[PDB]
Design a protein around this ligand. Structure first.
Ligand code: HEC
Ligand code: HEC
Ligand code: HEC
Ligand code: HEC
Ligand SMILES: [Ca+2]
Ligand SMILES: [Ca+2]
Lengths: 335, 335
């Protein structure tokens, strides 16, 4: 009941593979070469991503909530940050985030550099200020040396904007090539089991591809959560109106960015609300809410199996050795 | 001033270099062969050390408080754990902890496997139970497979004792060879500056080696903090009586394990109380309190420079890719 060639041909018309490596970002028709990724900026960004002294507590880094061992997420319903404060939304992965059209569940940041300024300043996340970050960095000569070399022409290289640019460069390399689906797409019939291929068939036939398409199986545009039927009160909490918070436009109530499904098997729990632990349940909810069809248990299990083939090679990251604090480095303030 | 040969001979009589590698642990007079380290147990212990699902919150791992990029510590006055609860003591490094005679500031744990059971269960740390840890592990087939292979001679390999043994095996590899001091000791006269050698000389001549000796420059036995003169109430809080809590022997009032000084330049703030940020001030406090000698600014700076030569090669650790949770994995309970 499986036609590999047919399945592959349909899939190539709507999805594409994650690239093997990244060398530039922000390529447009207007600026075709884009912004080069540099070894110095990637390395600086890695150090900063793992440095919990970028938070006011001294205890929270990006890695705290975007754990590179847990698919780039924290595995909690919603994140817990400074002072144990609980946030409103589930932490999405930074893996492959570079390919999404906008960042956050409501698309309120245009790119990774704009995004990175948010957690630093948010009271429920790192609860810090831009000038505190700069003063912290400037207190450690190895960090200053790195910024001066990474941003070589600038009179003022150690800036919050450049902190964000370095993090963006590092995150642009956090991609996950060679998932079983990408290997099947490239020609290996044996890369996926029959059940996983039945799931791929069902995902394409049911209409999931209207919102989950391209390189990231999502992440490109915005849709009501409940296009055809509302999900429950716990899954769609009434107080989080999604895109409406950004656009203040009537049609945008409970409109969210389509989740990019790469590595979804690693990033439970699901949806922006984080109350659905079972991926098969998220699949059933999506069919009911977005398409108005009830999936059979077999179709939901098949689709869930298929979604597992979107797990790519996870980055192997040696934890950086952080610069040592000096006498005027700001003291941690967890309390 | 400095005669390298006499200095080296003196130092060799009281200290030892960190070994290049480890292949066995718990080598004692009774059992000189010890216990072999195995690749399978080391790897399993690495995964466990970085897995925040070993805490009840789902957010706190060993690495949270013993950050491999910060010299194996959190860099806070005292640690902050489950629920943002602040603990009574500064977190010591796990680097080279394998060489210490006992673990914790009061020596209450005999070895690293016994130690590891403590943070798992402490309310202010990981706030979990042994049964939940075992059930969490058993819910993930990759973990079960690893335990069965790491402990092949056992019918019940997935136990809390074996969790602790695997962590111990991993931590035994977290040693820091080839510090400048060790390189000097091995015959490189040029490995240390003149000032560092003056510091070494002063460290030996002032009396510090009565308590800070052997491979780890401490960690081997217990002494009053205030042998000669009491330190201030902030440095020695009245409510933490140290070893007395363990033995209930009144001779042990305010008695602590001599701190092992390896990597001390990386692990501010200092003492069990974590209120002294400046290493040179800790050096002055130790001279006044333990010896009854007031160091000059120059002697304190020289000794502090020498202590910097105890920083070894920091482990370069690839962050592990953690097993994926399944349907019956216990849910995180941060709230
Ligand atoms: C937990 C307390 C967090 C910390 C610390 C950091 N992030 Fe995070 N991140 C968190 C949440 C809850 C969210 C979703 C918020 C929303 O309103 O949508 C995010 C989002 C991101 C993203 C967007 C990815 C996407 O939408 O697909 C990125 C790229 C990201 N976070 C990166 C990032 C960086 C670089 C951090 C250190 C400066 C950082 N985050 C910290 C939770 C938490
Ligand atoms: C647009 C009209 C959609 C269609 C058709 C499908 N999905 Fe979707 N999906 C969409 C959005 C806007 C979101 C985010 C909703 C939110 O606010 O949380 C999602 C999310 C998912 C998820 C969760 C992924 C996560 O990281 O949490 C899954 C597993 C998912 N979608 C799967 C899925 C399936 C299998 C579909 C066809 C049956 C389907 N979606 C259709 C938008 C749209
Ligand atoms: C912060 C909330 C912690 C977590 C999580 C873990 N540890 Fe820790 N550790 C912490 C403190 C405050 C202390 C000192 C407590 C005392 O009473 O002395 C320690 C101690 C250790 C040690 C002893 C090292 C020494 O005394 O030189 C080791 C080896 C150690 N901790 C390891 C360890 C492991 C393996 C953990 C995960 C299971 C773990 N700790 C978590 C703070 C915190
Ligand atoms: C035994 C009587 C000691 C003598 C002599 C010296 N030290 Fe010591 N040192 C001792 C103990 C019991 C402790 C732990 C005290 C506590 O409760 O915190 C220490 C600690 C240090 C430290 C702090 C290291 C840390 O990781 O926090 C330093 C820097 C230190 N000791 C240095 C030092 C110097 C330079 C000494 C000679 C002048 C000296 N110590 C003597 C026990 C004893
Ligand atoms: Ca999620
Ligand atoms: Ca310390």
């Amino acid at each position: 009941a499986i036609d590999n060639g047919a399945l592959r041909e349909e899939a190539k018309g709507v999805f594409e593979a994650i690239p093997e490596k990244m060398t530039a970002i922000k390529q447009t028709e207007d600026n075709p070469e884009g912004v080069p990724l540099t070894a110095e900026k990637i390395e600086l960004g890695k150090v900063l991503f793992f440095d919990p002294r970028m938070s006011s507590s001294g205890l929270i880094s990006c890695q705290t909530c975007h754990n590179v061992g847990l698919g780039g997420v924290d595995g909690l319903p919603t994140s817990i940050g400074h002072g144990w404060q609980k946030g409103p939304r589930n932490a999405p992965t930074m893996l492959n985030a570079i390919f999404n059209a906008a960042q956050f569940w409501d698309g309120r940041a245009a790119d990774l550099a704009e995004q990175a300024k948010g957690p630093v300043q948010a009271g429920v996340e790192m609860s810090n200020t831009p000038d505190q970050v700069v003063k912290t960095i400037n207190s450690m000569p190895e960090y200053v040396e790195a910024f001066k070399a990474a941003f070589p022409e600038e009179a003022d290289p150690v800036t919050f904007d450049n902190f964000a640019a370095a993090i963006e460069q590092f995150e642009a390399t956090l991609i996950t090539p060679n998932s079983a689906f990408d290997r099947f797409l490239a020609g290996d019939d044996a890369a996926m089991t029959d059940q996983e291929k039945r799931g791929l068939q069902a995902f394409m036939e049911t209409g999931c591809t209207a919102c989950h398409y391209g390189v990231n199986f999502g992440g490109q545009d915005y849709h009501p959560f409940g296009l055809i039927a509302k999900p429950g009160a716990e899954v769609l909490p009434a107080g989080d109106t999604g895109r409406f918070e950004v656009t203040r436009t009537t049609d945008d109530e409970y409109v969210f960015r389509a989740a990019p499904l790469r590595n979804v098997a690693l990033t439970a729990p699901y949806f922006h609300s984080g109350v659905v632990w079972e991926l098969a349940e998220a699949v059933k909810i999506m069919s009911s809410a977005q398409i108005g069809t009830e999936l059979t248990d077999q179709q939901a299990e098949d689709i869930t199996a298929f979604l597992g083939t979107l797990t790519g090679e996870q980055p192997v990251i040696d934890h950086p050795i952080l610069p040592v604090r000096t006498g005027t480095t700001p003291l941690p303030t967890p309390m």
